[PDB]
Amino acid sequence: ATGQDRVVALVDMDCFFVQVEQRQNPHLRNKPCAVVQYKSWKGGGIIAVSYEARAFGVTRSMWADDAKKLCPDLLLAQVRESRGKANLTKYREASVEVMEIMSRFAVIERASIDEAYVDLTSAVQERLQKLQGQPISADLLPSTYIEGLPQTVQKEGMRKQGLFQWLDSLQIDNLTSPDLQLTVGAVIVEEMRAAIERETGFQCSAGISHNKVLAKLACGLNKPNRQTLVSHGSVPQLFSQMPIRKIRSLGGKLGASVIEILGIEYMGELTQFTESQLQSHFGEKNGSWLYAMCRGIEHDPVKPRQLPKTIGCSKNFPGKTALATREQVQWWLLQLAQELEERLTKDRNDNDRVATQLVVSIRVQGDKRLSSLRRCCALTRYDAHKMSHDAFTVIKNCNTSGIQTEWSPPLTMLFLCATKFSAS
DNA sequence: ATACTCACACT
DNA sequence: AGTGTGAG
Ligand SMILES: O=c1[nH]c(=O)n([C@H]2C[C@H](O)[C@@H](COP(=O)(O)OP(=O)(O)OP(=O)(O)O)O2)cc1F
Ligand SMILES: [Ca+2]
Ligand SMILES: [Ca+2]
Fold it and tell me: Is the Cα torsion angle A206, A113, A94, A122 positive or negative in sign?
C-alpha cells in the first residue's frame, strides 16, 4: 500500500473574494487591496487580501484601520450587507461558476467556497491511451513546479530546470508508473486551470498528488497562479522539515498534542513510531491515519459533492450589542429566516432538493464556546415567519429572565441552519 | 469584535 | 440528538 493508486488535485482560488471584486471593479486590479465586512467597527474586519497588499504585511483578521497603518494606498471593497448582516451571494455565485467548469473534467468535491478536490485517476487513464506513447512537452506544463526539483537565479529559471529534470527522467513507456500519472494529472490541471481563467478571469493555484492532504500541501507551496506536483518520492524530504501544523487537520489541538506528547516538530518525525504507539496516544483512527500520513499515504476519498450539505445563517452580537429584549431576538431571527428562506428557494429551484430540519443555535454572554446551545425542529415550508417563530419556540425556555419582555442572559449570537436535505 | 460560514467526529 | 474540532 504505497498510496499511489489515485491522482488527486486540490485547486484553490487565489484570494477568491478579492479577485471577485477585482473583476467587477477594474480600478482595483493589480493593486494592494482587500475585502472587508462591517466598516463601522475599526474600518471593517479583513476577510481576504490581494498579494500586493500581502507584501506590506496585511492579513486576515486584521482591522482595516490596522491594515491602513501598514499600507495607506490599500484599496477596500466591502461585503454586501443585507438585512443588517453580511450578504455573501456574490461569492457563492462566483464559486458556482468555477465549480461548474471543474466538473467538466472530472468529479470534484467542493471543500470550501473557493477550493475543490479533484480525482483524476480515470481522466489520466484516458489521456494515457490517446497519447500513443509520445513524450510530454515541457510546453504542456507552463505553470507547474516539481517539488524537490531541481536537485538559475530567478524563480522561473529554477522552475524550468526542475521540470526539465523531472520530464527527462520520466518513463513514458510504462503507463502504470505513478510518477507518469502525476505528470498527466498536472497537465490536465493546467488545462483545467487554463479554462477557469479564460472563462471567469479568476486565477488559481493547484496541488497535484496522490491523496487529498498532499494535494493541499502541494497547493500552498507555490502560490499564486502556479501548480505544484508532489510525487510520492518528494515526501521524505518535503516532510523532513515540514511543521506538523501545516497538514490538514493537524492545525488544531490534536496536532498540538502530537507535538507535546511525542516531543517532535515535523511530519517526518512521526515515521519513527509504530502504529500501535500512535494509536495508543491518539486513538485507533488517528494513530492509523497518522502512521499512514507521515509516509504520504491517506485514503480519504474525493467525494462527489459539488453542492453543500447545509445552509447556515449566523450573526454575532459582541459586547454591548448583545440582544437583551425578547422583541429583538424575534427581529433578528426574522432577518435570519429571511435570508434563509431567500437562499433556500433558490436551492430548491436550482438543485431539485428541499431541507427538512431547522437548526437553531444561540450564544450567551459569559459563555466561552462558539455555540452555547443548539436546538432543532422540523422545517416544512420555506416561510421566513414560520421559521423564525419556530426558531423562537425552541429557544424561549432558555430565557432565564423572570420578566417576559427582557432576555437574560443577553444573546451574543444567533444561528439558523437548514439541514437534512431530500429530493424534490 | 474579523465574523460569518461549512464538514465531520464523538457521544 | 446535541457538542466540539478544524477549516475556509
Ligand atoms: O477565515 C476565513 N474567513 C472567510 O471569510 N474566508 C473567505 C474569504 C476567502 O477569499 C475565501 C477563501 O478563503 P482562503 O483561506 O482560501 O483565502 P484566499 O483569500 O482565497 O487566498 P489564498 O488561498 O491564500 O491564495 O473564503 C476564508 C477564511 F479562511
Ligand atoms: Ca483560495
Ligand atoms: Ca482556500
Answer: positive
